[PDB]
Amino acid sequence: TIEEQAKTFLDKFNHEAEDLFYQSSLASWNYNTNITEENVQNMNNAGDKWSAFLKEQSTLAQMYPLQEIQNLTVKLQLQALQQNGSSVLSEDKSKRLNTILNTMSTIYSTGKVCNPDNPQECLLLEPGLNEIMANSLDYNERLWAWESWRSEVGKQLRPLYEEYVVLKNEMARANHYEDYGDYWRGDYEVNGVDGYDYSRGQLIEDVEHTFEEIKPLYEHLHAYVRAKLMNAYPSYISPIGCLPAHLLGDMWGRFWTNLYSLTVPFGQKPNIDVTDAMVDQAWDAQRIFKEAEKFFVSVGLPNMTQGFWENSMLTDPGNVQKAVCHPTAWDLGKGDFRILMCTKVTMDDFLTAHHEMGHIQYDMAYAAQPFLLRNGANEGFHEAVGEIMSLSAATPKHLKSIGLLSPDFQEDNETEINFLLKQALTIVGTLPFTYMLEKWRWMVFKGEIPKDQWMKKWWEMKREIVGVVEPVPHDETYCDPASLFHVSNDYSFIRYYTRTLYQFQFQEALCQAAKHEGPLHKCDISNSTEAGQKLFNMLRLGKSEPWTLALENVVGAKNMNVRPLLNYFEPLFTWLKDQNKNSFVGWSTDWSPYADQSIKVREWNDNEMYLFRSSVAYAMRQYFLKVKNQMILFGEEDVRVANLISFNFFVTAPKNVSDIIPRTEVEKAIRMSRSRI
Ligand SMILES: CC(C)C[C@H](N[C@@H](Cc1cncn1Cc1cc(F)cc(Cl)c1)C(=O)O)C(=O)O
Ligand SMILES: *[C@@H]1O[C@H](CO)[C@@H](O)[C@H](O)[C@H]1NC(C)=O
Ligand SMILES: *[C@@H]1O[C@H](CO)[C@@H](O)[C@H](O)[C@H]1NC(C)=O
Ligand SMILES: *[C@@H]1O[C@H](CO)[C@@H](O)[C@H](O)[C@H]1NC(C)=O
Ligand SMILES: [Cl-]
Ligand code: NA
Ligand SMILES: [Zn+2]
């Protein structure tokens, strides 16, 4: 019969696929832990094997009727195996795309910028630039790191990324999607299950609908933060303008988390940022992941495996190897679970341990499922599980209990405004960032944004949707999207939007099962086996049930709903509306840090623009050797042109960028050399 054959086919495929998957997984591990030419080669071979095997089983599965399946377990598996991806591309195309992927990945993880005053002092993104963007209060140095990274590293990514889009769109349009974007939204698709179906376009709509309901609380968080940042960087921020992109606590403003030291509502209270308490005790990466383990075990979940501790890399290896430091949770297969994290002793590395270990715990739970279904019910479910736990672990109640807040820490209504504020800087601050990033990639893949307008459109969407403005104008030799890990390392990003809605929904139903009474934000599901079982019973399903039904069985809703996330932040919202009565709320897209020094302008090609920039640079060189008696090697690069028969420009001193030249000064220089034409 058909079923009995297919049953044995999928049974054989699943076990054969596990062992080939373990092989490329493990080769990807060694590459990521030990970036090396050899390991790139062992990776590429192991992957080539995996891909060729899938192409074989893909065609060999296209035989078994795509329809006529008795056990729906034995149907969706087939449906995936019949989609012969990658192989749609020629062997020349496919090897090129894998080369582009390894090149982007390698550039991003090895990219370095150097101090202009000391060329032998160079800085990786992790930890050097990251540490500057987390901690420096210097506007200029934060500018240097932000622009260096996008001009030394992002520019290397621009041409590769253009090819990446061409190749990925071809593999997708041949796998029968509208483009790579649509291929990605396919992670959320449910078909053939009435009352639980979900279409790829539904994802766009639900995301845009919910994002409307989140704007007000974002706008007020944006207004409060702007005001505080006007205090921390006096005279640099317009009270109706967008926030400068280098002033947000990390390289991109993905999270506004590190702005807590500048935005804390009630600085006199005991610190709810427990970084210092970890440093003052003997907290290392071992202690951190041991504490995260305690939490999942108190909830009823298993400990980590022996292999996990044996094979993870929870610290920076050193100068003995180059490793992708991005926290990542790996399910290599065959009971092999491990985490890659260059863990530091901050509260942020501490909540991230819980998040990454959440991935592991989900991976563990659905190990007992067929290989083809060993996945999240969708990608947001997977990202939400670590965050559920992170919500409980960040509560001052929980922190007090693991000795990081004094035993005398008094919960009052000012500490909760502090806690809710910090939470908002992470959770709410990231939602516009995330939506706008993915909205951009979705549009690039659909073809709605031409290549000559990628950066133009990118910084228009930053200003408009995010309330963030670039501090330096960027032309189409940049690829600012790709300077973030997820974009240069080819990962979807809506998982971070959808996990944020999911996580409060799940937190709501878990706090009820944990016999919580009171507001959601005071809830810590620690020690609740009833909470753990409710969650586990869903985790152990993998992707065997559609996610709409998996959501229903845990929280009683078929779809994502933003009501729980807003209830969580209701106290803080009220307080923010009060704190902002004398602030502007919203932003104008027109102000930019550099427009108050710019100058407008009267067959024209880029080479004309090159002679122009070179002339202005030359003019400047004279005007400082003449009207000032100095020699300054102004380059064409130091002439920054924006808003391009018309354009606006300003001049910066070479090796400083922040050092804009007074608009009145450049004018005299232009006049002084106006004779030469
Ligand atoms: C393969 C990917 C999809 C993995 C992806 N990694 C997380 C990492 C993380 C978790 N909590 C916060 N972060 C951000 C962060 C970045 C960083 F460099 C250092 C630190 Cl301490 C934190 C993510 O990017 O969100 C995931 O697990 O989703
Ligand atoms: C890193 O990779 C190189 C090349 O494969 C290898 O010789 C070296 O021993 C590796 N180092 C570690 C620590 O694995
Ligand atoms: C906290 O409580 C006091 C009175 O106990 C009140 O005046 C204040 O508005 C409350 N909220 C704060 C301080 O955010
Ligand atoms: C760059 O310009 C700023 C302008 O405020 C100045 O304060 C800073 O010292 C300069 N940095 C240099 C020249 O390295
Ligand atoms: Cl470094
Ligand atoms: Na920033
Ligand atoms: Zn994650």
Author numbering: 20 to 621, 634 to 675, 679 to 711
What does the paper say about this structure?
The aim of this study was to develop a 18F-based radiotracer for PET imaging of ACE2. Computer generated models suggested that the replacement of the chlorinated benzene ring of MLN-4760 with a fluorophenyl (F-MLN-4760) or fluoropyridine (F-Aza-MLN-4760) entity would not substantially affect the binding mode to ACE2 of human and mouse origin. Co-crystallization of the hACE2/F-MLN-4760 protein complex was performed for confirmation. The X-ray diffraction analysis of the co-crystallized hACE2/F-MLN-4760 further corroborated the analogous binding mode of F-MLN-4760 and MLN-4760 characterized by direct interactions between a carboxylate group of these compounds and the zinc ion site in a closed conformation of the hACE2 peptidase domain. The X-ray diffraction analysis confirmed an equal configuration of the F-MLN-4760 as for the known (S,S)-MLN-4760, indicating that the (S,S)-diastereoisomer of the synthesized F-MLN-4760 was correctly identified. The co-crystallization of F-MLN-4760 with hACE2 confirmed the correct (S,S)-configuration of the stereocenters of F-MLN-4760 and its conserved binding mode to the enzyme. Moreover, the obtained data highlighted that the para-position of the benzene ring does not have direct interaction with hACE2 and, hence, the insertion of a nitrogen atom in this position would not affect the binding mode of the resulting pyridine-based compound, F-Aza-MLN-4760. This was further corroborated in preclinical in vitro displacement studies using [3H]MLN-4760, which showed that the affinity of F-MLN-4760 and F-Aza-MLN-4760 to HEK-ACE2 cells was in a similar range, albeit 3-fold and 7-fold lower than that of MLN-4760. Preclinical investigations confirmed the specific binding of both radiotracers to HEK-ACE2 cells in vitro and selective binding to ACE2-expressing xenografts in vivo, while almost no uptake was seen in ACE-expressing cells and xenografts.
ACE2 is an enzyme involved in the renin-angiotensin-aldosterone-system (RAAS), as is the case also for the better-known angiotensin converting enzyme (ACE). ACE2 plays a counterregulatory role by cleaving angiotensin II to angiotensin 1–7 which interacts with the MAS receptor to induce vasodilatation and, hence, cardioprotective, anti-inflammatory effects. In March 2020, the World Health Organization announced the coronavirus disease 2019 (Covid-19) pandemic due to the worldwide increasing number of infections by the acute severe respiratory syndrome Coronavirus-2 (SARS-CoV-2) and the poorly understood risk factors for severe disease progression. It is known that SARS-CoV-2 interacts with the human angiotensin converting enzyme 2 (hACE2) and uses it as a cell entry receptor. The small-molecular-weight ACE2 inhibitor MLN-4760 was identified as a suitable lead structure as it was reported to bind to hACE2 with high affinity (IC50 = 0.44 nM) and to show cross reactivity to the mouse ACE2 (mACE2) but no binding to ACE.
